[model samples]
Target: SEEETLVFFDLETTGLDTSRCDIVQLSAISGAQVFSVYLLPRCCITEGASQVTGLWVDGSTLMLRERPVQTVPHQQALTGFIRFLQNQTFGRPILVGHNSRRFDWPILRRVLEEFGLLQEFRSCASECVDTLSLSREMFRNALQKFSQPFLVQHFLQQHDASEDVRTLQELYRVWRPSLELRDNHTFRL
Candidate 1:
């Protein structure tokens, strides 16, 4: 149970298969604060994935299509992200992200564990909510599409977490009215 501000985060990865892929980018929002970072990976970004996410590899550096600069070590990125989370909210935070439960969180948790930073990461946040699941439950047939792009107007960097955090902001704004969050700390439909 979380008793704090809701944080929304997003990750752009090398691929969908979490066991094989690594995160190239992470973006999050806690209140009005926005945090984003790019992490270098040893492997190349696959062609299709690169084309869609606008991320590619050049030597040891990871590059983003929208950002002018590139690259940070994994440990540095995760630690910085943890610090950013600590700075953003008033209490233990609740993380929200689209499809985060199966995709974003698990993959990020693995990276955190690898860097020996999972505890720090968990310390800043008490819970996580999957916006995708909530959207499906609330919209159900009221709309034909549930993906972020379908629900929001448009964006230049479709997969970038910075933009995704903004997208998530709008999504939550639209759906917060339908949710029944409890002070006792339970999410009920």
Candidate 2:
């Protein structure tokens, strides 16, 4: 058995296609600690993404209308994130997110790979858990599909790394300790 940081994080990217996209924003929450960064994109953020993120890139500038963005160079931001992750880990982090296994993990690895930091991150290691998986198992009886935004709207009023991490922490505490489960009916939320 080993101790690990419980990190809940999220990434806002330039597009849905990870093949041709870049991360514009990254946020992680570990207890009372929070790490957020805005990356100076290598290319343009699509119109659809721009609307949601309020992020746009011009030459070397990454501009945002969302409060005061934590501006930093892409390499620097990526490196800073690496540091944040390093400090957050005990043995490794239980990295949680909505569909993060499929979306966030690869994208993050790609970004780190682009900067040659991927291997460094792997040194500490991490375990990925997608909250969406549990949502599906628990909500399949009551709902037709899995949507993180919908879950947030109904269960959590706010949407952010901090809120998401906190929600997952609460969810795990209840489900794990109680061994609470779902059938073709419902489960406690």
Candidate 3:
């Protein structure tokens, strides 16, 4: 049977600026399917961004200079990713991500908009889940006590994107299971 869910994701841009930062890497995971792609930077790698993401613009690592930063131009990559999702889901699938509603999806939309490809991405909103909001609601107190990175390190040491996704998925699973057993559960000391 198909999973009926998919998560299209990307990681670590140059900075928080949607206009300047470029997606260094992207991945789409659907059930047992996974598709990933890395893009080359258009300009010199920003030092701060590079430090945080651990991505370098070196030709050996990123492959091309001035590669397709916009998702539209990279139809091949996107098509392959979508194919993986379709095979696992058998149709348009729900999209899931951490902080992706604001960060990833908006940026992807912006990229498409720049290239007049908005129609292709319009299907996303109806099928998207923002894990960050879910965490904010479910673990509000614990989240308030620590930064996202710190909480991830303390509870789950895997900091890379794929691992971080898995960590949040685990947290969601654990928290969701507990919800069935209680009405007003709280994180207590």
Candidate 4:
């Protein structure tokens, strides 16, 4: 089999609780191809989450910081993500994200399962790597903080999923980790 290609992704959700929160934005970038979609979540966005992500749900509208954003339904957004992955030119695509296994994967897997797209997603991706954990190993005692924002500052920053994915891609390159090291950090969906 050909070596797997890396597809960087990030999600912005309504809250932090993995079991309860809903994804507000889903974004992925594979080379120059980028896919981003906003979802009108069924749940209310928490104040803390709004403060961090600059996303809030209005009466029936999705607001980004201040302006309204066009959003699709949950099913549509999930389907689009799967389709985006399918279009990628990878024999086996490995998803890379910052703090993904702990914070992002659970929620993303739940959302995909809810929308009946988990199987499709699984078929598209071979595994996932968490840069947050990898960064700790790479930097060791050198860096005080391993959070994405801190990494962005120490290494280079953004709150948006698309922008975060771009930043993560750069950070990943800066680390210059081998495929073996990346494989060591792999987590499945």
Best by lDDT: 4
lDDT for each of the candidates? 0.75, 0.67, 0.54, 0.87
Q: For residues 81-186, could you state the per-residue lDDT of candidate 2 as single tens digits?
A: 7787787545456566777767777788888888888887766554556667767776668877666666655654543444555665565454452224322221
Report the CA-based lDDT of candidate 3 relative to the real structure. 0.54
Error of 3 at 44 (Å): 3.5
**Candidate 1 regions with alpha-carbon error over 4 angstroms:** 1-3, 66-68, 154-158, 177-189
TM-score of 4: 0.95
lDDT of 1 by residue, 141-180 (tens): 7867778877775322347779879878877786663445
Score every model by TM-score: 0.85, 0.78, 0.70, 0.95
Better of 1 and 2 by TM-score: 1
Evaluation by TM-score, superior candidate among 2 and 3: 2
Q: Give the worst 10-residue stretch by lDDT in candidate 3.
A: 180-189
**What value does the lDDT take at residue 79 in candidate 4?**
89
**Model 1, 113: alpha-carbon shift in Å?**
0.8
- RMSD of every prediction: 4.0, 5.3, 6.7, 1.6
**Segments of candidate 2 deviating more than 4 angstroms:** 66-70, 89-91, 158-189
Ranking by TM-score: 4, 1, 2, 3
Top-scoring candidate (TM-score):
4
